[PDB]
């Protein structure tokens, strides 16, 4: 729920929020106004949801799809980052192309006997696979793949002549990655894009060729299939290369882009004579939409220089050899308002009437669906563990979840808090501000919490703002990973709506190089509690930009998003997944619950398998810690939190009769509601089994205890309720989401909250 | 009424189109009305609720 | 099931090189037999439901809405699976132990 | 000699005895009387005594007898239970069907030389057994059998 | 093993082999009575013990 207040928005959230975004914590808040006005007109794709796999099953292969697959691993990739990917990869590649012999082994392992080329015969050995692993001997898969991909290239000239052999099918996941933003990130793209050939290259060319001799017939490939594989292979490798700055390759390009952009001159730099008109640049100038390079370049670092322009670049190569045209990583290639085309809104605030409380966010799946699978690794030699549907758990998780579908998809939280504002009046009016008021996205929370960072908290500094910084190969360096996109949450709906440009580079106390962004202006209503500035001239200047969306009328989305989710198991059974391990074990949860009476514990234990309870244990069912709900329910956790605190507080000092009563029932309503639909979620089954479980266990613990004449139980009473709530975590246990905090925090609130009966049920 | 109005949550004070829930505990509520009217004789204390 | 009398191996003069072919053959449609292989629904499910229904029918005190039903039963499996109630106490065995199925 | 007394039958043996059999330790002893009357008319076999073995000796094999044999092991089976049996088994099975190669070994180990298919000749190696153990290499018999049964297939 | 099963609250001292097996014994032992209750004298309903 991290946030901010217009005066304190910089005053505190000042770090997350972009007036910082640049150097300029500085002397005055960026802004003023100025010179070259424009809006880029582009970020690119929609990348989210869109879960999906590929098979890189066969050797004749792909020119360039695989590196794109490689970027996937990259993000899963333990080793960061891509730049790293490409270069380490170059190392393995070097080794293969360079070395003739290593190839002695591959060679026997096929046609590969001793003698050569063993002419017309055809010799029965070729598996898919089953070379592949033969290959898998030489260099262990740092991330192999070059276990599979080289095997494919090995499969690619190698099977055209009656030496095509082990048949394979392959699968590897869809993946959620961000906005996509970082200067580097372009660079990563560029190196990958080198793969995007350099590779493709390796795939490129290839041969239908001395087959082997043909020469009566096909026929001894002396080493010749082996030899051939190299000979021009890494020699393909020495018609292979790829060169200039991955980091360079644009850095320069961007500086130039900034020149053009920059109100405040690029001075000598200039649009230029075959420099541009380039027919790549123009609309790379256009493409400024993947704006903030210079913002992203300028802030973070402190410089770059074209260095290599040539004059006829950049251009000709100079800006034109470009990763962006390739559009590899789910960076998100596309037109304009899509990535806008989902956004989330708050209106509506009141009275003052704009400032006070207004989160934007959005739509969501709760598609029920999640999955069972078993990891039945069929071999070690590596990790893979073919897998399928194992249903019974997957489906019912889902089955339950449809009444789970009932609630807590977003607007429950939004509406509640948002309206929660009427309580409380009143119209303070400008003293609080303003508020961040606006924010609770799938967009990250998903991101590092799905990556185990749990970065939804990660804002915590990012709100608090000086940067966590506690680096570790996985570590904030990742709060860094979250940060560019989170900066991206605001802007983009600041991006669509209301192009109103320049502004200037914030000249600064320092540090002119180029360091600019457009003054986030539009129009404004007249009457302001707003921000640092007061400005009633239609709009606000803005080093905001969002408040104008704060200003920015509710609108409230169209935006239909709702994740989808995969179907690996049906494809597995045919062939292996590797999204894994990701998923983990991960068959929790298991709980023991006490039963309330006097002077007696009345404890009740749940055995995890038991709600599924089908006998007794299933050995290695693994589930994803599948996300989405975690994030959503998590906004939930906060607001039932947020509001309550607020209402409570209003009752506290205003102070004075009128406020409390209403809030208090209404607190009332909230509580009643919770207890009951907790009933509904919590019981509803499979939960009920809990609930009985609460009975069987307690009952025979009662009979087991001895003297039951005074056993009540169940008719009524919270003890009537207590069943309902024990069902209540319980359902909300064996979700991958919550955690167990939710309960007892829930439990506590709900419990005193009220629950006041009657009414079950 | 004022209190019902007031227990109209927490009033119309923000009058608007609003009140939506919690009407079994204002039978139990109209116990809250007990301060205005004493009601060991639950009757109205129960009955006052009905309307 | 299935299995093959088949490229033996070549026959093709005579029997004869099973390229991998005996090996290949063994799989190829084997686990591929395996992917014409499957088998699906609740082992636990597969009846649990069936039993609940059986109990409905059984139960003096109505199965209420549940009912003997229209091609539901007359099934020519169920009837005497209804019959077969003798492996009674499913619902007794199902009802007691656990607390539900649907 | 555990037992019970009619008043105490529930009074003590009350647990073993079926009035419990249901939930209803409860308030009153099940019963009263009521509604839809019937008796099922069936349990099924006589299974006891009836000791006996099988040979699953040969590969052309059995469609379905073996699993019944598998249920046998199941009860002897250390690992409980059957459900477990079937699913763990599905795992081994998956491995064999999925994998072409593992089959490189089986293949040499017969006609299995290098080259292929070595035409008319007939090559003298095949034991009963003596593949079988050749097979027995790939996945150790959690309960093998799929040591023998896969060998049979 | 009856010993509880007579005594009745269930042993419960589970282990992969363990009562979980007294469980194994239990269904059949429940079965000892019934079945000669089963043959002789079909006389039926009764009801679900409403409870």
Curated annotation (Swiss-Prot), chain A:
Q: Does the keyword Coiled coil apply?
A: no
GO CC terms: T=2 icosahedral viral capsid; viral inner capsid; viral nucleocapsid
The keyword Transcription is annotated on this UniProt entry: yes
Q: Which InterPro entries match?
A: P1 (IPR048856)
User: Major place of localization?
Assistant: virion
One Pfam family name is: P1
Q: Which domain of life is it from?
A: Viruses
Molecular function in Gene Ontology: identical protein binding; RNA binding
UniProt keywords (A-Z) are: Capsid protein, Inner capsid protein, RNA-binding, T=2 icosahedral capsid protein, Transcription, Viral nucleoprotein, Virion
User: Where found?
Assistant: Virion
Q: What does this protein do?
A: P1 is the major inner capsid (core) protein of the polyhedral procapsid, which is responsible for genomic replication and transcription. Forms a dodecahedral shell from 60 asymmetric dimers. Binds to RNA and may be involved in genomic packaging.
Q: How does it assemble?
A: Homodimer. Associates with the polymerase complex.
Please report the name of this protein according to its UniProt entry.
Major inner protein P1
Q: Which organism is it from?
A: Pseudomonas phage phi6
From Swiss-Prot, chain B:
Compartment list: Virion
**Role this protein plays:** P1 is the major inner capsid (core) protein of the polyhedral procapsid, which is responsible for genomic replication and transcription. Forms a dodecahedral shell from 60 asymmetric dimers. Binds to RNA and may be involved in genomic packaging.
Oligomeric and partner information? Homodimer. Associates with the polymerase complex.
Q: Know the name of this protein?
A: Major inner protein P1
Write the span of the intact protein that is present.
Answer: 103 to 153 of 769
